[PDB]
Amino acid sequence: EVEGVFVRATVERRCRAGFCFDKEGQGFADGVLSDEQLEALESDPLLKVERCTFSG
Amino acid sequence: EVEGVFVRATVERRCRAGFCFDKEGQGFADGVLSDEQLEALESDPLLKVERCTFSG
Amino acid sequence: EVEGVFVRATVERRCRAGFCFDKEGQGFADGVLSDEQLEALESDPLLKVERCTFSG
């Protein structure tokens, strides 16, 4: 299963090509991989958070 | 006027064939028909819900 | 710059063509121009607001 998605149609901080944006709802809560990079990707839900597990 | 609408891209339990999955249908707080089916279809929302005045 | 858009998740009053619909997320908060019409534009943020600057 998926512990949480926290999407609400908003990611925390998806930073690519040297610029940090806010979209695509790529929020995860698990230590499967890239936890160090998961800190950077996550840790900034500017807007509201809605958790709807996908049971993946 | 009908009071009752859900327009926050919110999730509700709508059952299509042998399963109940996210979808927005009736989404009203008043009922005159399909009450027994509406109960299954009108399960209160999972996520943020906000109401409007369709006045249909 | 745009100090606040006042758009996310909220919809404000927009009086056009004699009918005041609610859409397009035209929220703003500044003293640049059309300050008097700012009341009419922000006359119905019926839904929850979530500010985010566009840095305009």
Next chain:
Amino acid sequence: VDVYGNPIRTQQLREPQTSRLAGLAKEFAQHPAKGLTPAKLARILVEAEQGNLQAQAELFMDMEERDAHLFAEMSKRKRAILGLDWAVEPPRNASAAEKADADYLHELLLDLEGLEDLLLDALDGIGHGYSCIELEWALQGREWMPLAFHHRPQSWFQLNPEDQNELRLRDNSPAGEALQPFGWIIHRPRARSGYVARSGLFRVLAWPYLFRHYATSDLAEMLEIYGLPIRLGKYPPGTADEEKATLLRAVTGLGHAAAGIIPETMAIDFQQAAQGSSDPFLAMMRQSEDAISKAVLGGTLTSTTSQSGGGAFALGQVHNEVRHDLLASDARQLAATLSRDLLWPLLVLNRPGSPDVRRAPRLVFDLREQADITSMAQSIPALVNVGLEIPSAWVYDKLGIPQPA
């Protein structure tokens, strides 16, 4: 003016304030206690908190009427006050003019009929949280007189939208009507610190009353069902409607009827009706009654009764803790209310000049407790032979014996 400083105009004293509100006098209580559930009681209390005191007042009246234990406790508590001797005393180190004013006020109160009824009506505020008594002012020449005291139901008032501690008449307007100065004697005893709506004792006593009511009604129903057992008749296929009715009547009357006969193809089964005891109901009633007794009169003499046992110090033991404290509190609050509302208008209307408010005479209730005459009479001679110069004023005051004149 009054004690609160509000300007006083003698023009408005000729007619009662509520005279121009003939609608109020035609109202009837709605009896909200009938069919009362815990949810309804909670809604009533919450609405009262917000300024709708009518329903709360009517519920309190019904509660007083429908509970014998609560009514007996409240009546005993009030009759305790009603039996106290009272006197009017001049202020601290008063002058001759002040002494004369106090004496005249004392004489006026002695000869004023309906004082006991006024005290009884005022004491209703103990349970209701506030009692309003309207005054009738008349002139027998040059001196104003209270013609009569009228107790107005608590359902006639409300709360000010801009002030939760100020009461107002119900005049069909959102803001009500302010109370006329010198037209009322408002008694608001303070058992608990808070607003006027929450200050009633019946607010504390409501829940035990509902518990007792539910227990008593359930016990009455269970006693009604007790007796014969429920018995069910069974009939085979091919029993016509007339035979069905005959079987039904036979089953219905079988409990009273010792004997009966049915075909072997039929059957009657006697099932348990109601098997248990009155122990749970009675336990709940006792718990509620003990709670009411403790809340009204204290948990030393009423609920956990002090039991028997005489003696010289028995009076002190029974009274001083709990009973004396409650008696003194109620008497002092009533005396303060009276001195504020009734004594002051008489002083400022019936006498010349404008005496300072701080020097007004104060009504005092006689809270003197009977002291053992024999023990103390034994004690004095030893002390006086020793050499102590005990004043005679203390003796005369404490024994209740008056000084020689």
Next chain:
Amino acid sequence: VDVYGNPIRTQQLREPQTSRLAGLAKEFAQHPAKGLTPAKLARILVEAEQGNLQAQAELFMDMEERDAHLFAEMSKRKRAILGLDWAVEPPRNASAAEKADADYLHELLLDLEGLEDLLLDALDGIGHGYSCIELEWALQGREWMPLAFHHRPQSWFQLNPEDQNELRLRDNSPAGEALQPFGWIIHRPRARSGYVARSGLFRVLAWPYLFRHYATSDLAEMLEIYGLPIRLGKYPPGTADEEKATLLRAVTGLGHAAAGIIPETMAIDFQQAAQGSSDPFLAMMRQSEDAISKAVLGGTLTSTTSQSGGGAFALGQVHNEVRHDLLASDARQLAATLSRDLLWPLLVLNRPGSPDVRRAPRLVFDLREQADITSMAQSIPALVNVGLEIPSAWVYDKLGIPQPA
């Protein structure tokens, strides 16, 4: 200045501090006791620890209102203080000017109306952990006067983010507003050592209250279910909807109805409804009530009652241990608070000069305990005949008899 040394400006005394906060006066209590669970209570207490005193204050008010035993105990405890005689005494070996100042303050307190209400409002801090009373200052010429005392709900305040022992008004800002000097009488009795949030007695009493509430509600529900048994009807295949409804109504009314008939193909089974006793519930209620009694008034007279038994030393036996200690503690704390908050502004505004703070007069409550007159009156003559020179001042003070004048 005040006792704490903060500068005092007479300009701000003309208007109450909360006058410019008209929003507060329009608020209504949220009643957090309804639908309260142990998790909710724990969250409320923890949040209160962090500076959110509104919910805690409202919960405490509801707890006081909804529990008759707790309310009776608290009322008895407070009325114990309210009945004590009090006096204002000059400092140690005071001079003539200090004696005159103390006498004037004593006269002013005697003639100050609403003292009893002030004491009652202050005593709320015993349970709530802190009580704030706002002052109305007025000038009758050249001398400042407390016009009235207003008790403000504990829900109107909060904790300073930078200080957990300093209270502040709720003015919509994160840091609140500091309390105006000379504008309040803050009473904060200290039953336990700690911060102001944790210092209330209701914090100790909350859990027994919840236990008792749960037990009483469960007992009421079980009494409601008691009586008739639950009985279930069974029908065979081929029973239409109308016949199903008829069977359902028959089963529903069968308990009240002594007799009934059904086809042999149907069946009704009478199952146990609720079989047990009130013993567990009542045991829990008794445990909680004993805990409350011990916590409020001590486990020697209320919970484990001292029982009957008179005698000359019976007063001492009942009082000195537990009751006298609690009475003296409460009276001393209240007197200290009053001397700090009310006596000092009067001394420093109504009189000339700048007297040293250490020499301010102190309000003293009369804690004198009735001494056996007969035994001691027997005792003196032997001692005096022996040769001992006992001072008369000690006798007059201890007996309560005043010295000759």
Next chain:
Amino acid sequence: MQEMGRAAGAHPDELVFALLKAGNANLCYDGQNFFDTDHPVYPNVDGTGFAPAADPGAAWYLLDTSRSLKPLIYQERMKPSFTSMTKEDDEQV
């Protein structure tokens, strides 16, 4: 923010007079309009129909009676009581 109290105080007058305006449009217990020319009486039909109205005041009933079901409760959004102020702008309603 406290002016909402004045607004609420003025509200009952607005509600009562809006119902008074609707009087012609709205229906009474008879089933006809409040101000109608065909009010049904037992044997026959009666009739009572800029913006006028003639009413009694001394009767045991007052026309167009109001209903102060709940007081002018004040609803506020101050600080750590709503999400509008932490996970949102510094907004208060």
